[PDB]
Amino acid sequence: AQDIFLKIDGINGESLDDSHKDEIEVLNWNWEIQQKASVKDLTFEHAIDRASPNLMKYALTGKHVDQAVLVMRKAGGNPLEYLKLTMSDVIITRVRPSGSRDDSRETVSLSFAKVKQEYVVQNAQGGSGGAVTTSFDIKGN
Amino acid sequence: AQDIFLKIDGINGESLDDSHKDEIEVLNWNWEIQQKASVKDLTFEHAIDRASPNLMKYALTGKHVDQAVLVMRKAGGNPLEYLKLTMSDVIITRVRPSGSRRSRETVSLSFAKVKQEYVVQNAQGGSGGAVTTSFDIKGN
Amino acid sequence: AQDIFLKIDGINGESLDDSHKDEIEVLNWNWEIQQKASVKDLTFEHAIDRASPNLMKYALTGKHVDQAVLVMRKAGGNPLEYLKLTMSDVIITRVRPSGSRDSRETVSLSFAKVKQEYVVQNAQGGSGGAVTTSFDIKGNK
Amino acid sequence: AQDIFLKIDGINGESLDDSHKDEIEVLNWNWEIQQKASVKDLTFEHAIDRASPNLMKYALTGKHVDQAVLVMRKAGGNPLEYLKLTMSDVIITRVRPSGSRDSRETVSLSFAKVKQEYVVQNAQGGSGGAVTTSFDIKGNK
Amino acid sequence: AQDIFLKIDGINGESLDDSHKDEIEVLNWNWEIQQKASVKDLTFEHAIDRASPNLMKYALTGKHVDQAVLVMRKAGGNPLEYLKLTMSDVIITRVRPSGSRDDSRETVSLSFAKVKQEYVVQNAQGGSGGAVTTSFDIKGNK
Amino acid sequence: AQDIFLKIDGINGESLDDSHKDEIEVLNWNWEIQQKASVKDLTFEHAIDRASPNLMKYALTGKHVDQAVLVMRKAGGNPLEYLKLTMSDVIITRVRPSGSRDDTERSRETVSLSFAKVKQEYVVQNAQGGSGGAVTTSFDIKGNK
C-alpha cells in the first residue's frame, strides 16, 4: 500500500508524515487529457480533514492558489517518490463532501494553467534510476 | 460506527441522544459544489420518523426554516463532534419516502448561507484545532 | 418482516389479515416530491393478485377512485400502524406486470390530495405521539 | 418453479405438456402500461425453438395474427392456471435471437385488444374467485 | 457446451472440426429485428484468429461477400445442427479487437440483404425431427 | 498469461524483456472500426512508467510520431508474436493517469492513439506450437486506400 500526498499552497492537511507533514493525504486520484486539446480537472479523493473548510471556501470564492503538487511514494523499504505532478495557478472547481454512520470522504477537483510531471524509474535495488520530466503551459498553449 | 445528527428549526426528530435530543438521526448524507459557482442541494438519508410528515409539508409549501445544522460525532470513548455544517435560510427541496416488507427517506436541503467547522482530533482523542469558513451564497 | 397494506376503493386485494382483509399486500413502495413543487406518482410493488385485472382496466380507462390509503405496520408483539399515507382523487397511471418460470407487479398512483400520519413508538412498543400533515396538491393548498 | 405458456395462432412451439402441446414455453415475460394511455409491447423470453423461424418472418412481414394467449400455471399438486392474458390482433414487433458456446430469444408483441383473467387460489390449493377485465386499445374502449 | 460456427465466403478461420474446417468458431452471437421494419446488424464474438486481418480489410473497404452462414450444433452424442442462419450479400460493418495480458477476443458485426433461418427439432432419441424454414428479402422488401 | 508490448518512436517504456527492451508493456488494449468508415482511436492501458511524462507532452502538443507497433506474444515455451498491429503517423489523443493507496501500487494510465495507416499481421499456431501461416492486411485510412 503506497502513500499519496498533495501539497496545496495556503490549504494544509493533517498528514503526520515527517517528509510531507501538514499535507493532504490522497486516497485516490485521476486525471484526463483529450483532443487544441482539452485538459480535464484533476480529481482526487481524501477523507474530510483540516483542509475541508478551506477547500469549500476556495471553491465558492474561486480564488487562485499559487501551486499544487501531487506526489506518489512507493511503500516498503524503498520510499521513492516515483511520480510528482506539479500544477501552477490552481483553481478549486469542485468539492463533494459525504458521510455515513456505518464507517467520511471528500472528492475535490483542481483546475490549473500549468502542469509539470516528473517520473523516476526504480531499479532492482529499489533506488532511483532515470528521471523523466515534461512541462507544458496549458493557458499559454 | 459514528453518529450523525441534523437539527432543523421547527422540524423535530426522535433521537434519544442526551446532547442531541429531538434531532434527526442521519444514516448518510452528501453535498456538492461545482463551478460564479453552483451550490447543489444537500442530500441526507434518514429513517421515516416524526420529522417526515413536516418535511413533506414544508417541501410542498416551500416555506423557509431559519437554520439547519448537520453534525458528525465519532464513536468509542472519544465522542468528538468533528464536523458541524451550519446552513441558514434552509428550504426543503426534495423528499423521497420509501418502504419495504425498516424504511428510509431521502431529503434534500437548499440554503442561502453555509458555515463549516472541522475539529482535528489529537492522539488522546480530544479536540485539537478548529478550522471554520463561512460564505453567503445568496449575496455572493 | 413488517406488513404493508394498501386500500383502494373499488379495487380489492386478497389479504387474509384480520384487520386488513381484502386489501393489497404491498411488498415495497416509494414516493418522491421535487421542486410550485412537482409531486411524483406513488409507486408500489405487489404480487399479481385479485386486484391486478382491475388495476389494468382503471389504468387504461383512467377513471378516478375516491381514496387510496397506504399503511405500514410493525412486526412482533407490537403491531403498531406507524405510517398511514392517505391519498384522495387517485388515478392509476402505470401498471407493470411481470412473471418468471424460475410473480410481481409494479403500479404507480397519482392523486390530488395527500395526508401523512406518523406514530412514534415508545420503549414498551406502544403508541407515543402522532404527527399529521395534509396538503391539497391540485388546489395548491 | 411454475410453467408459463404462450399460444399464438399460426405460430406453434414444441411444448410437450399435454394441456399446452405445441405452444411456446415462456421462460419469463413482462408488460407495461403508462399514461389516453400508452400501451407498451408485451415482451416474453423463450429458448430458440420451432416458433423462431416463423416469429422472424412475421416480424419482418408485419402480418397480423388472430390471437395470442399467455397462461401461467402453478407448480406442485395444484396445477391451476391462475393468469390468462388474451391478446387480439397481435403483431410481432421485435425478435432478438442469441446464442453462446457455454440459447434464448426475446420477442415483443403488439395487440389491439387485451383481456386478463386472474384466478384466486384458496389455502387448500383449489380455484376460488375469477376476476376478468377487457379493453379495446385500438378502439379506445 | 455446444459448438457454434460461421462460414464467410473468402474469409476463412482456423476451426479444426472436420465438418466445419477453416470456419470461424463463434463464442457468442446476437441479432435483433425491430419495427417497414428495421433489421439490426448480426453481431458475433470470436477469438482473434486467421480471419481477423481479413475482417479488418472488409470493414475498411466495405466490400461485399457472397454469403455468410451461421450454424449452431448440439453437444454430446447427438451432433445435430439445430439452427442455420444464412445471410446473402453480407457487409462487414464493425470490428472490435481487444486483448489483455491476463487471459483475446474480437467482436464483429455483419450487415446482409437477405436472411434465411432453418431450425430442426430434436426428438427424444437425439435425432432430427421437423425442419422449419423461413426466408425474407430485406433489401427487396419481400 | 501472455505478454503485450507497444513500441512507439521517441516514447520509450521500461520493459526488461530482451526482445522488447525499453518498450511499453501493455496490460490491456482495445480498438474499434465502424461504418466511408469510421476508425476509432486505439486505446491501451499501461502502468505509469517512463513513457508517461512524454505521453502527456505529446497529447498536449499534438506532435506526430513516425510509427507505433503493438505486439501480442504467446506465453509458455513458444514465444510466438501471433499478432502485430503497425500504425503509421500516430497521434496521442488521450491520456488518463490514475492512482490509489488501496490497490498494490495502483498506477495505471489509459492512452488512446490516432493513426493514418494501419497494418495487421496474424500468425497461426499449429499443433506442436510452432508458427503456421501469416495473414497480413494494410490500409491507408487518411488516403482512403
Short mmCIF file of N, CA and C in Angstrom, two decimals, chain C residues 14 48-50 52-54 56-57 59-61 63 93-103, chain D residues 1-4 25-35 39 72 116 118 120 129 131 133 135:
data_model
loop_
_atom_site.label_atom_id
_atom_site.label_comp_id
_atom_site.label_asym_id
_atom_site.label_seq_id
_atom_site.Cartn_x
_atom_site.Cartn_y
_atom_site.Cartn_z
N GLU C 14 -56.34 -9.56 -1.95
CA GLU C 14 -56.67 -10.86 -1.37
C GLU C 14 -55.93 -11.08 -0.05
N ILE C 48 -48.91 -10.40 -8.34
CA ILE C 48 -50.12 -10.42 -9.16
C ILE C 48 -51.22 -11.13 -8.38
N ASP C 49 -52.35 -10.45 -8.21
CA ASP C 49 -53.40 -10.94 -7.33
C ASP C 49 -54.75 -10.50 -7.89
N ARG C 50 -55.79 -10.56 -7.05
CA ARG C 50 -57.15 -10.24 -7.49
C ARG C 50 -57.26 -8.82 -8.01
N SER C 52 -55.09 -7.16 -9.75
CA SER C 52 -54.36 -6.91 -10.99
C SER C 52 -55.28 -6.66 -12.19
N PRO C 53 -56.30 -7.48 -12.46
CA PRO C 53 -57.17 -7.17 -13.62
C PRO C 53 -57.86 -5.82 -13.52
N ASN C 54 -58.28 -5.42 -12.31
CA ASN C 54 -58.94 -4.13 -12.16
C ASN C 54 -57.96 -2.98 -12.25
N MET C 56 -55.31 -2.87 -14.18
CA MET C 56 -55.07 -2.66 -15.60
C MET C 56 -56.23 -1.91 -16.25
N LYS C 57 -57.47 -2.29 -15.92
CA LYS C 57 -58.62 -1.65 -16.55
C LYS C 57 -58.73 -0.18 -16.14
N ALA C 59 -56.22 1.72 -15.20
CA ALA C 59 -55.12 2.43 -15.85
C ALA C 59 -55.46 2.77 -17.30
N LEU C 60 -56.09 1.84 -18.01
CA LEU C 60 -56.46 2.09 -19.40
C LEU C 60 -57.59 3.11 -19.49
N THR C 61 -58.63 2.96 -18.67
CA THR C 61 -59.76 3.88 -18.70
C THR C 61 -59.42 5.22 -18.05
N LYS C 63 -60.23 6.14 -15.02
CA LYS C 63 -61.28 6.57 -14.10
C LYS C 63 -60.71 6.80 -12.71
N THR C 93 -51.93 5.26 -13.01
CA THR C 93 -51.15 5.80 -14.11
C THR C 93 -50.16 4.82 -14.72
N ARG C 94 -49.76 3.78 -14.00
CA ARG C 94 -48.77 2.84 -14.52
C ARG C 94 -49.00 1.47 -13.92
N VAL C 95 -49.02 0.45 -14.77
CA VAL C 95 -49.11 -0.95 -14.35
C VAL C 95 -48.07 -1.74 -15.11
N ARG C 96 -47.21 -2.46 -14.39
CA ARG C 96 -46.15 -3.27 -14.99
C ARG C 96 -46.19 -4.69 -14.44
N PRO C 97 -47.00 -5.57 -15.02
CA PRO C 97 -46.96 -6.98 -14.62
C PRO C 97 -45.70 -7.66 -15.15
N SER C 98 -45.28 -8.70 -14.44
CA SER C 98 -44.12 -9.48 -14.84
C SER C 98 -44.25 -10.89 -14.27
N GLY C 99 -43.57 -11.83 -14.92
CA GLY C 99 -43.60 -13.21 -14.48
C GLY C 99 -42.36 -13.96 -14.93
N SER C 100 -42.03 -15.01 -14.18
CA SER C 100 -40.85 -15.81 -14.45
C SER C 100 -41.15 -17.28 -14.14
N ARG C 101 -40.50 -18.16 -14.90
CA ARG C 101 -40.65 -19.59 -14.68
C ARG C 101 -39.83 -20.09 -13.50
N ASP C 102 -38.75 -19.40 -13.15
CA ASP C 102 -37.81 -19.89 -12.14
C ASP C 102 -38.16 -19.38 -10.74
N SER C 103 -44.75 -14.19 -8.95
CA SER C 103 -44.72 -13.12 -9.93
C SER C 103 -45.17 -11.83 -9.27
N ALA D 1 -41.09 -23.88 -9.11
CA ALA D 1 -40.94 -23.40 -10.48
C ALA D 1 -42.21 -23.63 -11.28
N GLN D 2 -42.91 -22.54 -11.59
CA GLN D 2 -44.17 -22.61 -12.32
C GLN D 2 -43.92 -22.82 -13.81
N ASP D 3 -45.00 -22.99 -14.56
CA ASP D 3 -44.95 -23.18 -16.00
C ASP D 3 -45.70 -22.04 -16.69
N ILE D 4 -45.08 -21.48 -17.73
CA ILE D 4 -45.66 -20.38 -18.49
C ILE D 4 -45.75 -20.80 -19.95
N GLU D 25 -43.13 -22.28 -24.74
CA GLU D 25 -42.82 -22.29 -23.32
C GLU D 25 -42.05 -21.02 -22.99
N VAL D 26 -42.68 -20.12 -22.23
CA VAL D 26 -42.11 -18.81 -21.94
C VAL D 26 -41.29 -18.89 -20.67
N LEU D 27 -40.00 -18.56 -20.77
CA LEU D 27 -39.15 -18.53 -19.59
C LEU D 27 -39.51 -17.37 -18.67
N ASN D 28 -39.68 -16.18 -19.24
CA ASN D 28 -40.07 -15.01 -18.48
C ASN D 28 -40.72 -14.01 -19.43
N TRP D 29 -41.48 -13.08 -18.85
CA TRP D 29 -42.21 -12.10 -19.64
C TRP D 29 -42.44 -10.85 -18.80
N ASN D 30 -42.76 -9.75 -19.49
CA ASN D 30 -43.09 -8.50 -18.83
C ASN D 30 -44.00 -7.69 -19.73
N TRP D 31 -44.73 -6.76 -19.11
CA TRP D 31 -45.64 -5.87 -19.81
C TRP D 31 -45.72 -4.56 -19.04
N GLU D 32 -46.09 -3.49 -19.74
CA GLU D 32 -46.13 -2.18 -19.12
C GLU D 32 -47.21 -1.32 -19.76
N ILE D 33 -47.88 -0.53 -18.92
CA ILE D 33 -48.88 0.45 -19.36
C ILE D 33 -48.55 1.77 -18.68
N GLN D 34 -48.58 2.86 -19.45
CA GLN D 34 -48.25 4.18 -18.92
C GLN D 34 -49.24 5.21 -19.43
N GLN D 35 -49.39 6.29 -18.66
CA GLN D 35 -50.27 7.39 -19.02
C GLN D 35 -49.50 8.48 -19.77
N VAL D 39 -49.90 1.97 -24.24
CA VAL D 39 -49.74 0.54 -24.01
C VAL D 39 -48.45 0.08 -24.67
N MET D 72 -50.16 -18.64 -17.21
CA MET D 72 -49.26 -19.06 -16.14
C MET D 72 -49.97 -20.08 -15.26
N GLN D 116 -57.53 -9.86 -19.44
CA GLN D 116 -56.80 -10.51 -18.35
C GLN D 116 -57.78 -11.25 -17.45
N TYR D 118 -57.72 -13.54 -13.87
CA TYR D 118 -56.98 -13.99 -12.70
C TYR D 118 -57.86 -14.88 -11.84
N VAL D 120 -58.09 -16.69 -8.11
CA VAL D 120 -57.59 -16.76 -6.74
C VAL D 120 -57.50 -18.22 -6.32
N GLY D 129 -62.07 -17.35 -6.68
CA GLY D 129 -62.81 -16.37 -7.46
C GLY D 129 -62.02 -15.95 -8.68
N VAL D 131 -61.53 -13.04 -11.63
CA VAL D 131 -61.75 -11.63 -11.96
C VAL D 131 -61.23 -11.39 -13.36
N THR D 133 -61.16 -8.59 -16.77
CA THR D 133 -61.35 -7.26 -17.34
C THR D 133 -60.92 -7.27 -18.80
N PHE D 135 -60.55 -4.61 -22.54
CA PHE D 135 -60.44 -3.25 -23.04
C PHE D 135 -60.06 -3.30 -24.52
#
